[PDB]
Design a protein around this ligand. Structure first.
Ligand SMILES: [Zn+2]
Length: 346
């Protein structure tokens, strides 16, 4: 079996083309936005994974839901969910059933009302932020790292895309995203402390903008992340104006730039993905690509993590970031770009 295989029965799509495969996950309730300027922060959830894979049928048979039992097939690391993937010959009714099962798993471990695609987008955002903040992937589960969790990312994306496409919500979110991009500069500092802020809308863009539109938008996203980092560094308690517009130590911007880098690297994984199909645009064509390309995606994710770890993480200055990011032909002088951008904010 060249592709994803169930660790219980050792079979995948070659011998079981219609059996749903799933990824063991561990999810916990967290604040959506730690910088939210409110004593009661809006709650969501953050998922991690060791990227251990089982059939939904095989897991449910061994249960005879009991996650103490499942941990033994999960390399002795904690799990409380089973994120389904949608194989090319798996019937949609079987996938949808297992996705409903996973949403029940998510409710039971997060005290959530209902897992929405918006909360799943925040989940991806929080996962990206764990890469970018160099926070532990294994402290709660006992095992897992950047390697296992980079491989989870395409499959959480697919669950967002599946719901976006089945409920016909993409065009609405395209308008929401354009609304964010059209916010005047007098709004940027406030957006830095909102739940649905630049980090959220960047992850939303990955789900609905094709690679060329990301190319035409990524520098403006970079501006939004740089201003967001400035406001959060100088006024962690919240602000509406940028009182301190002076360039700070690179630590002020480091995590936001790693966040940008990870998004850019995932777009690079999907660089040649068809941009429309019979059913819709990017949100549809990317979902179809993910269903059919487990192994090419596995290869591209390892390469993306290699670039992230070997090139972006050692970056120490904004000029070095632009070099590694391949942005120097679009941003001539890093020093002037950052200084002028921050001074431009009210
Ligand atoms: Zn199996």
């Amino acid at each position: 079996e060249p592709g994803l295989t169930c660790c219980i029965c050792r079979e995948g799509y070659k011998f079981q083309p219609t059996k749903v495969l799933g990824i063991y996950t561990f999810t916990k309730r967290v604040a959506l936005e730690e910088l939210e300027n409110k004593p009661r922060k809006q709650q969501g959830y953050s998922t991690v994974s060791h990227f251990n894979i089982v059939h939904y049928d095989c897991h449910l048979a061994a249960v005879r839901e009991e996650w103490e039992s499942a941990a033994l097939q999960n390399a002795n690391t904690k799990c409380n969910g089973l994120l389904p993937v949608w194989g090319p010959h798996v019937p949609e009714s079987a996938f949808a059933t297992c996705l409903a099962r996973h949403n029940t798993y998510l409710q039971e471990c997060t005290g959530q009302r209902e897992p929405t695609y918006q909360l799943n987008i925040h989940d991806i955002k929080l996962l990206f932020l764990r890469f970018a903040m160099e926070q532990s992937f294994s402290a709660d589960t006992g095992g897992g790292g950047r390697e296992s969790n980079i491989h989870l990312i395409p499959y959480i994306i697919h669950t967002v895309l599946y719901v976006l496409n089945t409920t016909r919500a993409t065009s609405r979110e395209e308008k929401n995203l354009q609304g964010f991009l059209e916010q005047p500069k007098e709004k940027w500092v406030e957006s830095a402390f909102e739940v649905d802020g630049p980090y959220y809308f960047t992850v939303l863009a990955l789900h609905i903008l094709p690679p060329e539109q990301w190319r035409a938008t990524r520098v403006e996203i970079l501006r939004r992340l740089l201003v967001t980092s400035q406001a959060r560094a100088v006024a962690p308690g919240g602000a509406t104006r940028l009182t301190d517009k002076a360039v700070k130590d690179y630590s002020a911007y480091r995590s936001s730039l790693l966040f940008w880098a990870l998004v850019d690297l995932i777009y690079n994984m999907f660089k040649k993905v068809p941009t429309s199909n019979t059913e819709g645009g990017w949100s549809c064509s990317l979902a179809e690509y993910i269903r059919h390309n487990d192994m090419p995606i596995y290869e591209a994710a390892d390469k993306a993590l290699k670039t992230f770890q070997e090139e972006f993480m050692p970056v120490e200055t904004f000029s070095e970031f632009l070099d590694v990011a391949g942005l120097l032909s679009e941003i001539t002088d890093p020093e002037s770009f950052l200084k002028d951008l921050l001074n431009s904010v009210p």
